[PDB]
Design a protein around this nucleic acid. Structure first.
Ligand SMILES: [Mg+2]
Ligand SMILES: [Mg+2]
Lengths: 55, 55, 171, 67, 72, 98, 104
RNA sequence: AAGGGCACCACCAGGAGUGGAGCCUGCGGCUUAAUUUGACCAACACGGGAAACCUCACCCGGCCCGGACACGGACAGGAUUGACAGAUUGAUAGCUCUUUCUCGAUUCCGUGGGUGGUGGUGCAUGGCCGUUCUUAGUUGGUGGAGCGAUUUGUCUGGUUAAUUCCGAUAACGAACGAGACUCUGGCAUGCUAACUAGUUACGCGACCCCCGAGCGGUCGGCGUCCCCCAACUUCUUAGAGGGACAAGUGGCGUUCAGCCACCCGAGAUUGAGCAAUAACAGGUCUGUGAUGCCCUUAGAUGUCCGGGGCUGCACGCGCGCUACACUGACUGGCUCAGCGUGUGCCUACCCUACGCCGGCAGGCGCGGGUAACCCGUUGAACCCCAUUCGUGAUGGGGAUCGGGGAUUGCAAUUAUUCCCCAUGAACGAGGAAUUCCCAGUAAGUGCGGGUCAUAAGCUUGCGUUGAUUAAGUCCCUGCCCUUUGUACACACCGCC
């Protein structure tokens, strides 16, 4: 809570610096093509984004 | 005693809840609101600041 | 250019924007007969078209809600003033919009209509508006612990192949 | 649970009365017994605190100590 | 391709190129009297092998091979 | 909870310049994306507008990771008697060139 | 001025891209401006392979998601100035354009 | 219980294997402060779960409220807010203490009421997914039988991948599923085109030649949209098309549905995606600002920070990698790919050409590329050609362990990774058992992507080399249908 150590731990990388852009989850994140999207969330919005199962 | 050492049931068809069973049972046959039906159911600020700081 | 972005990331970014815009509009205009959104993007400006059954409600008083929504999406997405637009359009044959029908079931079931009464009412409406077939499924728990699923189907229904993609509307 | 330590008591401020650390003598002669912060951001309003071996500004006018 | 595929491509392209050149510029009656030897020796000398490859599936290491399954 | 007065008036005057205001749900962002030159972070924007919402002056909607606070007619007059505005000055969404 | 322009067309669906390419070429031919036939870059295939299940249970069934990007280059060479000659883009949703100088 | 049918998640005939060894990893157990946790064909390289921090949910400690709002108190004569120096603490947490300043209605205390939770319940739920099942099954209308629920249609038989069709036929005509469909691969010297793909021809070149080749040979050398200063699309790419239908011939069959062979043909069965009625108290509340209820909520199960743990080992099991060698290992030379990635809102992190330094891991400056423009003609590996080794736990195998050098990161110890020099362990083809598999397949072999600040023994795809056996059956293992029995219908996990 004190400004010295409320956020002091560096998070410029690693699995904790990256969260899903939809639900802020930190597991199964897809960063390919800059998606930055949680995995189950991507399946939900797959057609909305434009991805289509062809084969 | 209904579980094994891990904690998985040895009888999934033997409902461990007294209120409900494996097969859903209609309350009052499906009558009343908030319930499945029956056959009977089937049938400007910036300019204001400008004048304020003008003088 | 280096300031520009690769085409693959550009099209991904557009799909993300469309999905978030549609999700936001769904959570916003759910009670206002939301149907869908269509966006036409040009490098000069972008147009947003909200398809909805009740434009009289999506539009605000003297257009208040449209100006309000186009402002809030401009602040969110960082668009310039003249590069963002917001139009509301009615949906013809609303009985053929699975999103709109699923919204009316939500309204009826929230009020407290019987599941059979509401589902058969919408079933007759969709067939009346003209469709080869339709199918509504309601699942969950009502007044009891054990959950049940009811299915109400009539007419023709396809499931397989490419034609399920552009013949059946699902919501 | 079952904390081996006991509950920690948070600080309670002394709730002292009005400042009254500068007076006037002989029908009015202003006299301050507290140092002044001269920094541009510190301003003239703040009064440097007095300690037994140092002086510390109310804001961060650093700390002037004598060795 | 690889070494063998480039070998077969070379020998097959030589046969096809000579046959086509012979067809375009001299009599095809005498094209037949060398084409018949070509087809009676190896049909692959003038017809490409249609088989290319098969896509891998997500159940095993290869297209048709599956991973080991264990019951106990 | 605690804000400097300059932060509170700056947040309110943006909420009255236009009836809407967005904020990414990130309490640790050093500054709000808008009005960052007022040196007030996204955290103070968050709690100030949840307190407006609890009092009913603002209606709140939440998309993926952003808030979409709106200004209500009830909250319009409350902002007038807080920021001392006469009954003529209106936000942009309420009136534009009319 | 003698100016040449390079109009590049990018889309996700081919029917719209072929339509906007067709009536742009027809517009150029109607304007007697010499034009190259639209050259097609190979389609960029954005392939993603996630898992169908949202948990760890299942038969390890993977879902394959495909996106296709189609890109076309159309070359215009007018002896006079060209921007004032052609001013209509005749675009449809889903496809974007970009204008570049042939020398740039 | 009987009868038919089908299937390399069944067998036959075989291939490669696993189970035997070392090691990586995941379970169980043991230990521990914690070794977080779900899952027991259809869990066990699974939660995209390759965790140093974060992740993190577990343990040991310590900050903060980020407890809205309403009411009542206190308060501009001060509600309250931060803090230098010392002690104090892991901490430069004013956390606490001495210490006085400063902050100025923003708070503080009490009473209600929020709020949050990777906390519980998947046996309260949604959604998604897995399986039965990707087998071939499923349901109306009219008509016939029935008092009726119901039945026939949906069947003895032939055929098919398929209730797929043909046929008998109280059924006739349909619908879903199957098929069809979309994508993909193979072919079009046919069309459209291309300095971000080129190919031929030609002009300068550079070398080999001169026995003379001379319109000689090689060039991934320079050029011909450097716009007047060549053409064309064969190769590359991608669009509209075409092309294949059991279509032609012979044979088998009720000579019908179809089956076998053969000619011409690129192809005479290319792989996928989608996928019915329903069931599984199947898995997920640890994907979500999906969610009911319960629990906690200021000494917090919230949130942040530090450290440890998730790796720990008498042992058992599962997916794997490397091997046991000469069909080989080492050394050198030669030489061929295609998927596909690449500079970021937050986000601080890109792919790499060239030169110089080092033996290497690497470092230092120049650039190119937001990309058919640069990496890149992706000079890949196996393989091929030569040399050494010579049946020896051997120059096989590289575990374990010592010393040293770098890179990534705030931090490398419980070794992150990589490199160098040393030790050289089991392992000499592996019991009972067991898995996968029919053509560019298995298998050998490397390469991208996902994970990623650092990272692959995993996975997802790609390409290279490239087979043995079989065109069958119900013996084993299952599953489906028909008949049959039933005191079951919450449906055998039944009833009793
Ligand atoms: Mg099909
Ligand atoms: Mg050694």
């Amino acid at each position: 809570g004190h400004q010295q150590l409320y956020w002091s731990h560096p998070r410029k990388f690693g699995q904790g610096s990256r969260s899903c852009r939809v639900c802020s989850n930190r597991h199964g994140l897809i960063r390919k093509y800059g998606l930055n999207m949680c995995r189950q969330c991507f399946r939900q919005y797959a057609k909305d984004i434009g991805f289509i199962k062809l084969d | 005693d209904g579980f094994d050492s891990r904690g998985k049931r040895e009888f999934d068809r033997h409902s461990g809840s007294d209120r409900s069973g494996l097969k859903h049972e209609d309350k009052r046959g499906g009558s009343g609101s908030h319930n499945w039906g029956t056959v009977k159911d089937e049938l400007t600020l910036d300019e204001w600041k400008a004048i304020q700081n003008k003088d | 250019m280096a300031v520009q972005i690769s085409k693959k990331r550009k099209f991904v970014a557009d799909g993300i924007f469309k999905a978030e815009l549609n999700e936001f509009l769904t959570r916003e205009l759910a009670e206002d007969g939301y149907s869908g959104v269509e966006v036409r993007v040009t490098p000069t400006r972008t147009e947003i078209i909200i398809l909805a059954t009740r434009t009289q409600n999506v539009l605000g008083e003297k257009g208040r809600r449209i100006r309000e929504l186009t402002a809030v999406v401009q602040k969110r997405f960082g668009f310039p003033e003249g590069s963002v637009e917001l139009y509301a359009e009615k949906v013809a044959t609303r009985g053929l919009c699975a999103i709109a029908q699923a919204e009316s079931l939500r309204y009826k079931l929230l009020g407290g209509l019987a599941v059979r009464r509401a589902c058969y009412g919408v079933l007759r409406f969709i067939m009346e508006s003209g469709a080869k077939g339709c199918e509504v499924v309601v699942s969950g728990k009502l007044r009891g612990q054990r959950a049940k699923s009811m299915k109400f189907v009539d007419g023709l229904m396809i499931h397989s192949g490419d034609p399920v993609n552009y013949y059946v509307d699902t919501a | 649970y079952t904390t081996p330590k006991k509950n920690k008591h948070k600080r309670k401020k002394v709730k002292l009365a009005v400042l009254k650390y500068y007076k006037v003598d002989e029908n009015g002669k202003i006299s301050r017994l507290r140092r002044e912060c001269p920094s541009d951001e510190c301003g003239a309003g703040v009064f440097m605190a007095s300690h037994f071996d140092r002086h510390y500004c109310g804001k961060c006018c650093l700390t002037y100590c004598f060795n | 391709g690889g070494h063998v595929a480039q070998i077969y491509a070379i020998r097959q392209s030589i046969s096809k190129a000579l046959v086509a050149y012979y067809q375009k510029y001299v009599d095809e009656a005498s094209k037949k009297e060398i084409k018949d030897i070509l087809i009676q020796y190896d049909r692959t000398l003038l017809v490409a092998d249609p088989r290319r490859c098969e896509s891998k599936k997500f159940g095993g290491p290869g297209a048709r091979a599956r991973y080991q399954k264990s019951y106990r | 909870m605690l804000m400097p007065k300059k932060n509170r008036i700056a947040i309110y005057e943006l909420l009255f310049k236009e009836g809407v205001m967005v904020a990414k749900k990130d309490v640790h962002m050093p500054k709000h994306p808008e009005l960052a030159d007022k040196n007030v972070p996204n955290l103070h924007v968050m709690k100030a507008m949840q307190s407006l919402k609890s009092r009913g002056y603002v209606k709140e909607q939440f998309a993926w990771r952003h808030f979409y606070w709106y200004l209500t007619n009830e909250g319009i007059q409350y902002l007038r008697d807080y920021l001392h505005l006469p009954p003529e000055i209106v936000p942009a969404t309420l009136r534009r060139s009319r | 001025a003698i100016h040449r322009i390079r109009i590049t067309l990018t889309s996700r669906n081919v029917k719209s891209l072929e339509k906007v390419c067709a009536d742009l070429i027809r517009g150029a031919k109607e304007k007697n401006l010499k034009v190259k036939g639209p050259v097609r870059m190979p389609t960029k295939t954005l392939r993603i392979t996630t898992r169908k299940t949202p948990c760890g249970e299942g038969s390890k069934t993977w879902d394959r998601f495909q996106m296709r990007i189609h890109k076309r280059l159309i070359d215009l060479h007018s002896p006079s100035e060209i921007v004032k000659q052609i001013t209509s883009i005749s675009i449809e949703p889903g496809v974007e354009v970009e204008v570049t100088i042939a020398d740039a």
